[PDB]
Amino acid sequence: SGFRKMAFPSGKVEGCMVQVTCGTTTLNGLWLDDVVYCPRHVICTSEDMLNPNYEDLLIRKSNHNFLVQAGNVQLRVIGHSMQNCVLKLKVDTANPKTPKYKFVRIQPGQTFSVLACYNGSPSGVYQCAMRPNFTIKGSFLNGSCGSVGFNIDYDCVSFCYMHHMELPTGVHAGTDLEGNFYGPFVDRQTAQAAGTDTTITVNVLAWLYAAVINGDRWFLNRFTTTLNDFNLVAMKYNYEPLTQDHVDILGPLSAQTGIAVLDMCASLKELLQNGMNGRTILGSALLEDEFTPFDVVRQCSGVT
């Protein structure tokens, strides 16, 4: 028993972290096979970031201008190309530590681990969620760009995110491993404001199931609700509308605890309308939305 914001073991991803220097800019790269992936703003100076023309800026860069360093050895760059907002630096040596991997573009609400890096060296690992407004609430500093988000299925790593930028509101924006930004963000130093940060309803419900499985049951009540009734209350509190699909995904959690999904929605509805009244659920004084139904089942069953 016990519930923690648990990240995937980062070992497989540490072996892929390299340092990419272009001029005076140093950031992190992801070395998989003979390719090093990094954010394309490595070729920019602070001033360039105001109105960058990446195709133009790229012309002035050659293979020998990108300094790729793995640990303390230098990698030879034999080719470079821009795919969307990521640069792909083809090196002559394939990464001996390349795990089985996939590049996946996640949906908002989905969660993943982040291995925060600086100078290609990992410094920490935390569990994040892709917010419904396509931002992430991470912990990134200058030099952290190129740090990646990932999921693991036994031995295969699914890379889903690369960090690119901090918006003026302190939230984070990045791309998938094909260079496409999540959301409407662009790699420019301009006025970019995120949309409403709604709460991931299916994730709070999963975490309420996780609490019940661990002994925290005070929030369980005698009431039930319907999808349309619950959603009228979810709308008012900036909670994502709950669909029959989310209900189905909570099925295994509903089965293990014997609490029908609509009964847990009615509990969540009361928590929304009345607050926690100074109480805690899983040691948290607010409704946690960064555990998916899959994460609860995984943590509660011990998937290695």
CA angle, corner 289, sides to 122 and 13, nearest 5?
20
Q: Check binding of 53 to ligand UGV (CB under 6 A).
A: no
Candidate list 14, 34, 166, 270; residue touching ligand UGV; CB under 6 A: 166
Candidate list 6, 78, 94, 141; residue touching ligand UGV; CB under 6 A: 141
CB under 8 A, 24+ apart: contacts of 270-274: 270/219, 270/221, 270/223, 271/219, 272/233, 272/234, 272/236, 272/237, 272/239, 273/233
Q: Specify whether the CB–CB gap between 231 and 190 falls below 8 A.
A: no
- Token pair belonging to 192: 């970019």
Among a second copy, ligand UGV, none, the one that 273 touches (CB under a kind-dependent 5 to 8 A) is: none
Q: Which of 145, 160, 164, 246 is catalytic?
A: 145
CB of 145 to ligand UGV, least distance (A): 5
Q: Look at the chain and count its residues.
A: 304
Q: Check binding of 125 to a second copy (CB under 8 A).
A: yes
Taking the C-alpha atoms of residue 300 and residue 253, their distance in angstroms, rounded to an integer, is 10
> Which of these segments, 10-18, 76-84, 140-148, 254-262, binds ligand UGV (CB under 6 A)?
140-148
Q: Which of residues 177-236 bind ligand UGV (CB under 6 A)?
A: 187-189
Nearer to ligand UGV, 181 or 239 (CB): 181
Candidate list 24, 62, 142, 304; residue touching ligand UGV; CB under 6 A: 142
Among a second copy, ligand UGV, none, the one that 71 touches (CB under a kind-dependent 5 to 8 A) is: none
Q: Which of 16, 22, 38, 41 is catalytic?
A: 41
Q: Check binding of 41 to ligand UGV (CB under 6 A).
A: yes
Q: Check binding of 299 to ligand UGV (CB under 6 A).
A: no
Q: Is 145 a catalytic residue?
A: yes
How far the first Cα of the chain sits from its last, in Å, is: 17
Q: Check binding of 165 to ligand UGV (CB under 6 A).
A: yes
Q: Check binding of 303 to a second copy (CB under 8 A).
A: yes
- Token pair belonging to 153: 């299925």
Q: Is 111 exposed, middle or buried, given 0-12, 13-18 or 19+ CB atoms closer than 10 A? A: buried
CA distance readout (Å), 109 to 39, 170, 198: 24, 20, 10
Q: Is 164 a catalytic residue?
A: no
All residues at 6 or more sequence positions from 283 whose CB lies less than 8 Å from its CB, including other chains: none
- Sign of the torsion angle spanned by Cα atoms 224, 245, 272, 233: negative
Report, as residue numbers or ranges, the catalytic residues.
41, 145
Where does this chain bind ligand UGV (CB under 6 A)?
Answer: 41, 49, 140-142, 144-145, 165-166, 172, 187-189
Where does this chain bind a second copy (CB under 8 A)?
Answer: 1-12, 14-15, 115-119, 121-126, 128, 137-141, 143-144, 166, 170-172, 214-215, 275-276, 278, 280, 283-286, 298-304
